[PDB]
Design a protein around this ligand. Structure first.
Ligand code: NAP
Ligand code: NAP
Lengths: 310, 310
């Protein structure tokens, strides 16, 4: 088989050599402009139109968990990927654990009031504070997918009450499952901590706005791990300033890098990470891609729903 | 039976009523000065000499995990507790989980470089940083007891390499056990993170000094969860200033409250909590005390070694 690989910043030769070892019958090459030679599979991140247009590929593997970029490119350029070509994304491949690390650390940070103790330390002021209790710290996960379920699983270990929101009902024994826009208000009413693990789709853009935030309990916390477009940043800032939201830790933003003029940078209740919550682990991605191609070849169960948008 | 209770700041009537429900045959009273009436068990925190002196008690229950205070008082006042009287302390009773919450949150915080991102956020500066790897983040637990083992167990969940140090060899399958002063240098050589869960005894006072810190890997982290006397604070500050130690989170100090003149308060790589790492959970302490008395009465297995000092 023939595999073409494109990624704008990764160690390309590293990936080619790992793919060749994992798929020893494959001829793997880096795609450059002008390469119209035959290919069976394409591995891509932010590919240019010309790399895929007209190609009757057996599959395309997008090298990320999110697919809002490629799907929006395919809508602007319908000629880019034939409907006959299945599109795959990276499910977990190590990003599950990374989301768990981030969420557990920061949920515990807030639960143990390390944010309040830091404020007090800034004034060299010693004062034990009342303990918080699990019953008042229900954690709601917006998005109940590959990453949402991993984050829910790790927080259940700590015995926090847990609820999740998605389009379809979930069956996780200790997690209350809310589904659809018609159940979102009830979902939000109890979320002391709100963790966002939704995909970017037309249906979820701007969903964390003033009406959503007002339905949370007072003194809530927001952990945005998903996409910046999900949050109306001026609405979040107003809820932080009014005390509705006690703290927000944000990995993603409407414009990235976050412009220095944004009030989020210097706001005392905001913590910023520069879109680093979960990165693809190359060796796990190669194992997942190699395994998927083998299953495709054998006609076994294994994918992105372009109509659905994620 | 007769139980006398003394605690200088807890909700005394709450404890008396919970002890009466858990031990319905018991007459429970708060000890005041002048009460020389008979008693079978004493429940105490920082008791005055007069409460125990001359009393042939069946047992004394110290209402804490640490016992350096009462043991030092007994050495200064040998007449206070007859050698015939067994002394018990609170083992876990909820402090296990609290130590796990603290340690897991902060270990993950450091592993994911939230301390570096915070420094960068202070300047509104956006910059992804290289990932750290588990193989470079061995965690060493100084003290391998009730709380040490719980902290080790929770960090193994995250697949960090783990080692522990104590007087006697441990058998935890995935944790390398170092024992005695003669093995401490080898123990320390690999500790990217050093977590202190030792008791305060004459043998461990000042153990985290300049010679210990210099044996750690560069860029190490210190989490002092145990006693302030374990750390020579000026030696820690010199190791922070030289870059040997990248970060220190401290819950305890040689003088408490930490005096405002201490350079630890404003040091950029130090995080301070005001001795709040793990507090006794009253209902769990009552359950443990009630269960222990029942086992004593039935002649079953169940205690502080005064000769040993912890
Ligand atoms: N560094 C980073 O910040 C980083 C890294 C990786 C990924 N991510 C983000 O995390 C996202 C999730 O990854 P994943 O693998 O967990 O995705 P996934 O497996 O597709 O899960 C998506 C979840 O969102 C739900 N959802 C989608 N549209 C919805 C709507 N309109 N209403 C309610 N729920 C809806 C789905 O519900 P159903 O279960 O009913 O379908 C599903 O539970 C990605 O889209 C990406 O944006 C961020
Ligand atoms: N808020 C707080 O900060 C807070 C709250 C509760 C407790 N604590 C602290 O945590 C301590 C530990 O509690 P615990 O219940 O885990 O105590 P523990 O069960 O008695 O464990 C003590 C451990 O320290 C080791 N040890 C004692 N002396 C030693 C020496 N000279 N060299 C090497 N190892 C030595 C013991 O080794 P062996 O196993 O060989 O005997 C044992 O593993 C308490 O003493 C207290 O100071 C702090």
């Amino acid at each position: 088989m023939d595999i073409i690989f494109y990624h704008p910043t990764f160690d390309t030769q590293w990936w080619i050599e790992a793919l060749r070892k994992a798929i020893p019958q494959a001829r793997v090459r880096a795609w450059k402009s002008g390469d119209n030679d035959s290919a069976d599979y394409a591995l891509v991140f932010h590919p240019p139109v010309e790399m895929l247009a007209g190609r009757d590929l057996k599959a395309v593997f997008a090298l990320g968990a999110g697919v809002d970029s490629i799907l929006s490119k395919l809508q602007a350029h319908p000629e880019m990927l034939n409907p006959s070509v299945p599109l795959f994304r990276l499910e977990d491949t190590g990003m599950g654990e990374q989301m768990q690390e981030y969420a557990v650390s920061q949920v515990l940070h807030w639960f143990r009031r390390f944010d309040d103790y830091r404020i007090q330390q800034n004034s060299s002021h010693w004062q034990p504070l009342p303990e918080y209790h699990r019953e008042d710290f229900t954690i709601g996960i917006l998005g109940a997918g590959v990453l949402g379920s991993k984050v829910a699983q790790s927080l259940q270990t700590w015995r926090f009450p847990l609820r999740c929101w998605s389009r379809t009902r979930k069956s996780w024994p200790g997690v209350q499952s809310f589904a659809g826009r018609e159940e979102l208000s009830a979902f939000l009413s109890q979320c002391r901590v709100l963790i966002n693990l939704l995909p970017n789709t037309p249906e979820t853009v701007g969903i964390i706005n003033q009406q959503l935030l007002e339905k949370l309990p007072d003194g809530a916390y927001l952990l945005n791990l998903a996409r910046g477009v999900h949050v109306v940043e001026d609405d979040l800032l107003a809820a932080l300033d009014s005390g509705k939201v006690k703290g927000a830790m944000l990995d993603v933003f409407n414009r990235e890098p976050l412009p220095p003029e944004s009030p989020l940078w210097q706001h005392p209740r905001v913590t910023i990470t520069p879109h680093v919550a979960a990165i693809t682990r190359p060796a796990e991605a190669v194992e997942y891609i190699s395994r998927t191609i083998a299953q495709l070849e054998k006609g076994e169960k294994v994918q992105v729903d372009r109509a659905r948008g994620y």
